[PDB]
Amino acid sequence: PVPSRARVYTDVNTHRPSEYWDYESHVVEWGNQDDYQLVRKLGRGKYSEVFEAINITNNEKVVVKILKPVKKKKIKREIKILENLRGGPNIITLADIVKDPVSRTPALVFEHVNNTDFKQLYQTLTDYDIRFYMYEILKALDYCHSMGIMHRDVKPHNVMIDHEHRKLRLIDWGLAEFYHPGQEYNVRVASRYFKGPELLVDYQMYDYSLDMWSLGCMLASMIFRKEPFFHGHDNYDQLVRIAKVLGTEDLYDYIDKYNIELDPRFNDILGRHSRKRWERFVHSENQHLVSPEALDFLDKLLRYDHQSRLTAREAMEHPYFYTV
Amino acid sequence: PVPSRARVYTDVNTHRPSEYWDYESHVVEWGNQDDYQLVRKLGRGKYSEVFEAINITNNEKVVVKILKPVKKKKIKREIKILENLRGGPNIITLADIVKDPVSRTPALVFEHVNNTDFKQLYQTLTDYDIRFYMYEILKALDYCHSMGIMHRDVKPHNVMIDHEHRKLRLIDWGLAEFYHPGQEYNVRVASRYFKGPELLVDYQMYDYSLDMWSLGCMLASMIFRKEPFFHGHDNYDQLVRIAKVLGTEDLYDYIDKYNIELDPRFNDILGRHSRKRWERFVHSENQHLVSPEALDFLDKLLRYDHQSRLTAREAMEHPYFYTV
Ligand SMILES: O=P(O)(O)O[C@H]1[C@H](OP(=O)(O)O)[C@@H](OP(=O)(O)O)[C@H](OP(=O)(O)O)[C@@H](OP(=O)(O)O)[C@H]1OP(=O)(O)O
Ligand SMILES: Nc1ncnc2c1ncn2[C@@H]1O[C@H](COP(=O)(O)OP(=O)(O)O)[C@@H](O)[C@H]1O
Ligand SMILES: Nc1ncnc2c1ncn2[C@@H]1O[C@H](COP(=O)(O)OP(=O)(O)O)[C@@H](O)[C@H]1O
Ligand SMILES: COc1ccccc1-c1ccc(CN)cc1Cl
Ligand SMILES: [Cl-]
Ligand SMILES: [Mg+2]
Ligand SMILES: [Mg+2]
């Protein structure tokens, strides 16, 4: 397969010392969980149990993500990445790294966010709200991309929104990774609906643009009121669901441009599909959220070719955000 | 001790939401320092290392103040105040807040000022130049005072003057504080020469008028060519240097009025002093910078009683500024 490199922030990690990007050598200092009293369960997940808590030393509400001890390299990478991004625009703030004395279970302590419900926002968000919140996510992505980090799990559940205070935080940095140009990464990242074509065709030399695909999936689901936009039932089907909108002609041009090898499992399910016009997804239910600007912006995000996709910084200059 | 409050802008912070002055809760968004390339060192305070720099995204000269990580509350207060005052007349403009990815060191980014040398100005400034620059500082003071902020470190080193373009900027807002009427403040603020009598007698319920005393010290050093005007060798000796000029009779009256208690360490050193006439400091070396209006203005700034001092707004109305 043909090699590939990011169009932006290509060498930001190469021009930094080992200590910045080397998470496996970085020393983590685990505090005492006794400084925090647990209140209520909030969420759950891929090897985690989130709780609301109070820091008993200053009476502040915090969130305690109690990690299910899986690969130690993974915990170290999340801690290193959160530590490197701490302070960044719309990035969840890691406040402490603690261990419960008895259980010895690793736990991460974050700033508390009053998360408005996915279904509650999906019903109340105006055309202005979409542009505003999309822009806020772009601040977070351009920032972590400038810091040489690919989030690799962009989706609505990993975006905490407090609509009342108009606050947005990009959370769940457990799959995030340092970008090193020419590196081959595991393609078993991101949630199925948000997986870029590069992960589905098993093209390992992917970059920050992966997150731009995932962001495109989110925008399409909001403006068209169709969640998820690309509804795959499995990883193989996921590509088919992409091809049914972007067409099979550009999919082959993409695989050919990078000399990728398809899985014999695909020919029997892929088929032949025409490219669809973005306006065909417009209906009475969503037309108040749709605009020519929105369709042009989406079309520039949802591209098979990961190099042809708008960068977070280019995305910030798009006419769709002029009203913000 | 008797309570006291400012004569102007007394309740400006009380009539504003918590967001405005609660710097400890305010969320700071740290950008990427990679947008800036460092050129050279400029200054080196007790709290920071100041560097000239280039913004590599637009080829603009900026100043990057690399904060030595001391109390986090202090950094937050400085940021919040700079953010609140951003745009004000003759106030240094905070352009960015960034952190170097590797060092994770907090740094503040300001507009660049071509600072003319303290000793170079002291030798070239005419009677007119003094009146002009004195007025520009007053604009900055009246502004931050109207915004409920006390600079608390007014002195020539924290005033940047670009004489060529006649530009003045009040910098170094790291000791600045929100004024809340009736609050007791730490008296270990300002530089020794510029400390108002209230700090020396350990009177904690001080206001904006502290900034007017410091300004008076600056004026006296310029018009009389004697830097510093009140040359204390320590914080106790500092009150003695003032009393040798203002006299010990008014000193005691001031102490009695607010019921302040003197430190047994002043007994042996204070002594008895007559009030000196301001014309006693006129000599051949400085007589071209002195005038009756200059002496009247100074006399109205250099008063023991912090409530009897001109406010920045009253000072602008003074006959000393009619030629400007
Ligand atoms: O005598 P001090 O109370 O200490 O303070 C200063 C200082 O004195 P020192 O540095 O010798 O301690 C000046 O000295 P420099 O810093 O310039 O070297 C000195 O000036 P000269 O060296 O010119 O004598 C000046 O005295 P003056 O301005 O009256 O000549 C004097 O100031 P005070 O009289 O205000 O204390
Ligand atoms: N800072 C936070 N504020 C509020 N809720 C949070 C926060 N972090 C996590 N949660 C809740 O926990 C859930 C899982 O958190 P996340 O970090 O995504 O863990 P996982 O990796 O298990 O998904 C989120 O969907 C959210 O409901
Ligand atoms: N905007 C600026 N333009 C030019 N020089 C500056 C500027 N800001 C700071 N400096 C230089 O840096 C020095 C120290 O800056 P300052 O804000 O006073 O820091 P500190 O509180 O650590 O003393 C100043 O005395 C001045 O020489
Ligand atoms: C005693 O100083 C002053 C008195 C009156 C007016 C201006 C100044 C002044 C302010 C800042 C700088 C720059 N370091 C230089 C000077 Cl001369
Ligand atoms: Cl200077
Ligand atoms: Mg400064
Ligand atoms: Mg300074």
Author numbering:
A (entry chain B), B (entry chain A): 4 to 327
Article sentences:
CK2 is a serine/threonine kinase that is a key regulator of many cellular processes and is involved in cellular proliferation and anti-apoptotic mechanisms. In vivo it exists mainly as a holoenzyme composed of two catalytic (α and/or α′) and a dimer of regulatory (β) subunits, but it can also be found as the isolated subunits. Unlike most other kinases it is constitutively active and more than 300 proteins have been identified as CK2 substrates, making it probably one of the most pleiotropic proteins in eukaryotic systems. Hence, CK2 has been recognised as a highly promising target for anti-cancer therapies.
Modelling studies indicated that 1 contains the right vectors to grow into the Tyr channel by substitutions on the 2-position of ring A. The compounds tested so far were not able to effectively inhibit the protein activity as ATP was not displaced. Indeed, most of the co-crystal structures featured a molecule of ATP/ADP in the ATP binding site as well as the ligands bound in the αD pocket.
